[PDB]
Amino acid sequence: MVDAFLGTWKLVDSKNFDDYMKSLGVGFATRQVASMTKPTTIIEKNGDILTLKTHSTFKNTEISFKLGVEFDETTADDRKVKSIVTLDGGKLVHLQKWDGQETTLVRELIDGKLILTLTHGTAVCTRTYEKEA
């Protein structure tokens, strides 16, 4: 199920992150810092509890969740959202809801790389992560 996602991942490419951040209403000064940042994502499991850490020189987040169980999340850009993470077609789909809006964060393994697709409104961002061993 989730075991191929587990580990430490480092960003190696990013397309259209600015467009996604603009769509969410992130201010120009935070978008500048975010365009140069190369986060590390750590995904860990303990039984049926996942933990997802995102580390960087700018901002750090951590969430723990069970698949298929809604949780409260405060995002890096300070949205208060209702979240759920599920396995769909082998992808890890994270849906965030707030104020009648949605965004999806979809993680898929392709050729040993982690591809993160971020959709909000018309904005689509693809991030590519490589595994640190």
Binding site for ligand 6NA (CB under 6 A): 39, 41, 54, 75-77, 116, 127
**Does 128 show up as a binding residue in the annotation?**
yes
> Do residues 111 and 8 touch, judged by C-beta distance below 8 A?
no
Instruction: Return the closest-CA partner of residue 35 out of 52, 53, 55, 19.
Output: 19
Residue closer to ligand 6NA, measured from CB, 67 or 119: 119
> Do residues 30 and 21 touch, judged by C-beta distance below 8 A?
yes
**Does 117 show up as a binding residue in the annotation?**
no
DSSP 26-82: --HHHHHHHHH---EEEEEEETTEEEEEEE-SS--EEEEE-TT--EEEE-TT--EEE
Minimum CB distance to ligand 6NA, residue 34 (Å): 8
Residue closer to ligand 6NA, measured from CB, 36 or 47: 36
Residue closer to ligand 6NA, measured from CB, 76 or 123: 76
Minimum CB distance to ligand 6NA, residue 8 (Å): 13
Minimum CB distance to ligand 6NA, residue 70 (Å): 19
Binding-site residue set: 127-129
